[PDB]
Design a protein around this nucleic acid. Structure first.
Ligand SMILES: [Ca+2]
Ligand SMILES: [Zn+2]
Ligand SMILES: [Zn+2]
Length: 54
DNA sequence: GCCACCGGTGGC
DNA sequence: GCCACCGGTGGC
């Protein structure tokens, strides 16, 4: 429960990255160049994340 | 004013 | 020293 996490929504309760969204595809562990550096789209808090991350 | 980056660090 | 993931912003 931080500035960007309500700790209660479905996104906040996911711990696993989907591996198929733009943010995951950017990640090194999914073969990306690690230039965007955000959490999986599915883990973006529904209440508190920047709107364009949702 | 928005958002794709990019710089930075809390918490290991 | 690393890595997840945040906040600031150049360029639009
Ligand atoms: Ca540190
Ligand atoms: Zn994802
Ligand atoms: Zn949430």
């Amino acid at each position: 429960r931080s500035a960007r996490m309500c700790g209660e929504c479905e996104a906040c309760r996911r711990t696993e990255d989907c591996g198929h969204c733009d943010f995951c595809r950017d990640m090194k562990k999914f073969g990306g160049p690690n230039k965007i550096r955000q959490k999986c789209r599915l883990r973006q808090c529904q209440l508190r994340a920047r709107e364009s991350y949702k």
